[PDB]
C-alpha cells in the first residue's frame, strides 16, 4: 500500500530505501500454509518495490556490483518459481507474482538485467517465458499511435463529446490541470475557439442569473 501511495509520500533517498526494502523482504522469501502466504505477500510487496526501481549497492565497479545484486535477486526469484513448478491457486498466484517481480526488476535495470533475462527466456516454464517476453516488449519499444484526435473530435453541432464528458466526471482537484491540458491541446490544433465556445456556453446555460455568471 505504501508503494502505491509512494507518489503521495516524500523521500530523501527513495531509491536506496526501496533497494534496502527489497533486500530485507527477499530474506523472507523461503505453519506451512502461513509461510506460503508470507511468500505471496512478500512477493506482492517486492513487485510493488520493484516498479521503476534502479538498483543501488552500498563508478565502473558500481555498475558491476549492481549487476551482481541483480543476479542475486533474479536467482532467488528463479528458485522460487522452480519450487512452484486452494493449495494449487496459491502456488499459481505466487508464480504470477514472481514473474511480475522479475518483470519490474528488468524494466528498470536494463543494463544490468538483459543478459540474465535471456536465461529467463530459455526457462522450462512457458507462462513465465511469455510474460518475460512482454517485459522485453516494454524495454525495446521504450529505447504515430498517440491519437489525441478523440479528445478534439467534434460531433454534429460541435459537441466536443469526450471533453464535455471528461469535464463532468474528473475530480475537482485535477480541474486546475485539466484546463491546462485542454487549452494547450486545442490551441495546438487551431480549435481554441471551439473549446471556449462549448465550455462558456455550458456556464451561461446553467447559471441562475447574470450575477452568478462566471463568479466562483
Amino acid at each position: 500500500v505504501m508503494m502505491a501511495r509512494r507518489d503521495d509520500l516524500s523521500f530523501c533517498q527513495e531509491m536506496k530505501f526501496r533497494n534496502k526494502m527489497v533486500e530485507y523482504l527477499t530474506d523472507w522469501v523461503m505453519v506451512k500454509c502461513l509461510t506460503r502466504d508470507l511468500d505471496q505477500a512478500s512477493m506482492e510487496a517486492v513487485v510493488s518495490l520493484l516498479a521503476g526501481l534502479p538498483l543501488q549497492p552500498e563508478g565502473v565497479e558500481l555498475m558491476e556490483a549492481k549487476s551482481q545484486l541483480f543476479l542475486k535477486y533474479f536467482t532467488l526469484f528463479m528458485n522460487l518459481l522452480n519450487d512452484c513448478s486452494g493449495m494449487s491457486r496459491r502456488l499459481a498466484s505466487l508464480r504470477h507474482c514472481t514473474v511480475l517481480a522479475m518483470s519490474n526488476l528488468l524494466n528498470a535495470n536494463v543494463d544490468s538485467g538483459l543478459m540474465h533475462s535471456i536465461g529467463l527466456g530459455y526457462h522450462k516454464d512457458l507462462q513465465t517465458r511469455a510474460t518475460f517476453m512482454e517485459v522485453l516488449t516494454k524495454i525495446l519499444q521504450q529505447g504515430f499511435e498517440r491519437l489525441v484526435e478523440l479528445v478534439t473530435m467534434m460531433g454534429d453541432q460541435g459537441e466536443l463529446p469526450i471533453a464535455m464528458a471528461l469535464a463532468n466526471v474528473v475530480p475537482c482537484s485535477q480541474w486546475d490541470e485539466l484546463a491546462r491540458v485542454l487549452v494547450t491541446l486545442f490551441d495546438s490544433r487551431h480549435l481554441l475557439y471551439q473549446l471556449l465556445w462549448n465550455m462558456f456556453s455550458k456556464e451561461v446555460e446553467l447559471a441562475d442569473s447574470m450575477q452568478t455568471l462566471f463568479r466562483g
Binding site: 530459455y122 512457458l126 511469455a130 517476453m133 525495446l140 519499444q141
Partner: protein, 436 residues
C-alpha cells in the same frame, strides 16, 4: 544536500568573462549533463543560484554543444520545465545566446521537439557561431572561456575539403582529422548554420575503405555506419586509422538473443506464449528496423496456431538475408536454446537455423580474430549439439551439415580437435559435409 555540491564540481554551467556589450557571460556545457544521472531539478536550481545575483540585469549565455548527443538530452518534461521555472524578466534579460558546435543530433532534436521550441525559431537572440573565430565578434579573445577540452579540438587539424556524406540526400562536408577526433563539418543546414559532428578516436569502432573514392566509419552506439566519398579516401582512412591506433596504444591494458527467444517460443504448445512471442518479434522488428516480408503487426490476444513452422522459417531466412550482422549473435543463442529444448523445439530450431548458416562465411571473410573465433565456437557448439542430440542426428546432418558444406578448414580442424562417439559422429557427419 551533499549530492548538490556535486553539480558545482561538474561545472556544466559557469560564469566567465564579460561581453563586448558589457554583460556577464555564462557557459552551458551540454555534454557534461548526462540525462538520468543528475537530478534535473538540481541542475536547474544550480543554474538559478548561479544567475540569481545577475539575472536582474542583462546577461549573455554561451551554449557549448560540442559532442552533444542523446545522453545529454533534455527529456520532454524537463525541456518544457526550463521555459517556466525562471522569472519572466530573467528570460527577457538574455541579450545574446551564442551557440557553439551545434551538430546533426541537436538539429534532429530541434525538429523532434519543434512544438516546445517554436519561440526559439528565427529568434534574433540565438547566434550560431560559424567557427571558433567568429566568437570574437561578440567576445574579446582574452575574454573567451570555452572548456579547454573544446579548444583542444581546434588545433593541428588535417583538413579534407569537399567530401560527400552519402545519405538519402548527399551532403557537402569537410572532414577534419585531429589527434583525438574526427570532425565532420557541414554546409548551411537549417536559421542556416554550419554543423560540426564530432567523433572521438575512442568511439571509432571500425574504418573501412570501400573504393579508392569511398570509405565508412562505424561509430560506437550509432548502428548505421557513416559513408563518405572523396578522391583522397586512401589518405583520409590512413590518418583516421593512425588516430584510432594512437588512442588504442594509450589505453591502460540484444537483437540476436531476443530474436531467438521470439522465434523459438513461436513454436510452443502454449497459446499465450505464441502470442507473446509474436508481439516480441514485432517489437524487435520495429526497434531494430528489421526488414520483413508479409508484414508484422503488434497486438494483444492474437491467437496464433501451434504449427506455424513454415511462418517461423520464412521470417528467419528473410531475416538471414536481410540482417546478417545478427548471424553470429543469433546462431550461438539458438544452439544454446537447442540444449534447453524439447525434441519438437529442437527440430524447429534446425529449420529456422538453416538459412542463418550461409551468413557465417561473411564473418571469416572479416579479418577480426574475435569474429573468426566466434564462428569457430559456433561450429564447436554445432558439433556438440550434433554429438548429443542423437534422435535428431540424421536430420541435423541433412539440414545443418549439408548447408555448412556449401570455412571448411576451420570446420575440419574443429571436427578433428573435438575427435582428439565424438570421433565416429565427426566421421559420419563429414559424409554430409562433403556433399556441399
Amino acid at each position: 544536500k551533499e549530492e548538490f555540491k556535486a553539480l558545482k564540481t561538474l561545472s556544466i554551467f559557469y560564469q566567465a568573462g564579460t561581453s563586448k556589450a558589457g554583460n556577464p557571460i555564462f557557459y552551458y556545457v551540454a555534454r557534461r549533463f548526462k540525462t538520468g544521472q543528475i537530478n534535473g531539478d538540481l541542475l536547474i536550481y544550480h543554474v538559478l543560484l548561479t544567475l540569481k545575483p545577475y539575472y536582474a540585469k542583462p546577461y549573455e549565455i554561451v551554449v557549448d554543444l560540442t559532442h552533444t548527443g542523446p545522453s545529454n538530452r533534455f527529456k520532454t518534461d524537463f525541456l518544457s520545465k526550463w521555459f517556466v521555472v525562471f522569472p519572466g524578466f530573467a528570460y527577457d534579460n538574455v541579450s545574446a545566446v551564442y551557440i557553439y558546435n551545434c551538430n546533426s543530433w541537436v538539429r534532429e532534436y530541434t525538429k523532434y521537439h519543434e512544438r516546445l521550441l517554436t519561440g526559439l525559431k528565427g529568434s534574433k537572440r540565438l547566434v550560431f557561431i560559424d567557427c571558433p573565430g567568429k566568437l570574437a565578434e561578440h567576445i574579446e579573445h582574452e575574454q573567451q572561456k570555452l572548456p579547454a577540452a573544446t579548444l583542444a579540438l581546434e588545433e593541428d587539424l588535417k583538413v579534407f575539403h569537399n567530401a560527400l556524406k552519402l545519405a538519402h540526400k548527399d551532403t557537402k562536408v569537410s572532414i577534419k582529422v585531429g589527434s583525438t577526433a574526427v570532425q565532420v563539418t557541414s554546409a548551411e543546414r537549417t536559421q542556416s548554420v554550419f554543423l560540426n559532428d564530432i567523433y572521438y578516436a575512442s568511439e571509432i569502432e571500425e574504418i573501412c575503405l570501400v573504393d579508392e573514392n569511398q570509405f565508412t566509419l562505424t561509430i560506437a552506439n550509432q548502428g548505421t555506419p557513416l559513408t563518405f566519398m572523396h578522391q583522397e579516401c586512401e589518405a583520409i582512412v590512413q590518418s583516421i586509422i593512425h588516430i584510432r591506433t594512437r588512442w588504442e596504444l594509450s589505453q591502460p591494458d540484444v537483437p540476436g538473443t531476443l530474436l531467438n527467444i521470439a522465434l523459438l517460443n513461436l513454436g510452443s504448445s502454449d497459446p499465450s506464449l505464441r502470442s507473446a512471442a509474436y508481439n516480441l518479434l514485432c517489437a524487435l522488428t520495429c526497434t531494430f528496423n528489421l526488414k520483413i516480408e508479409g508484414q508484422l503487426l503488434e497486438t494483444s490476444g492474437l491467437c496464433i496456431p501451434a504449427n506455424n513452422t513454415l511462418f517461423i522459417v520464412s521470417i528467419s531466412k528473410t531475416l538471414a538475408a536481410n540482417e546478417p550482422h545478427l548471424t553470429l549473435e543469433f546462431l550461438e543463442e539458438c544452439i544454446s536454446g537447442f540444449s534447453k529444448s524439447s525434441i519438437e523445439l529442437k527440430h524447429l530450431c534446425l529449420e529456422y537455423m538453416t538459412p542463418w548458416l550461409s551468413n557465417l562465411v561473411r564473418f571469416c571473410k572479416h579479418n577480426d580474430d574475435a569474429k573468426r573465433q566466434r564462428v569457430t565456437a559456433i561450429l564447436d557448439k554445432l558439433i556438440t549439439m550434433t554429438i548429443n542430440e542423437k534422435q535428431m542426428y540424421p536430420s541435423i546432418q541433412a539440414k545443418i551439415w549439408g548447408s555448412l558444406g556449401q570455412l571448411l578448414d576451420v570446420v575440419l580442424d574443429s571436427f578433428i580437435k573435438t575427435s582428439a562417439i565424438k570421433a565416429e559422429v565427426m566421421a559420419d557427419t563429414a559424409v554430409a559435409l562433403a556433399s556441399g
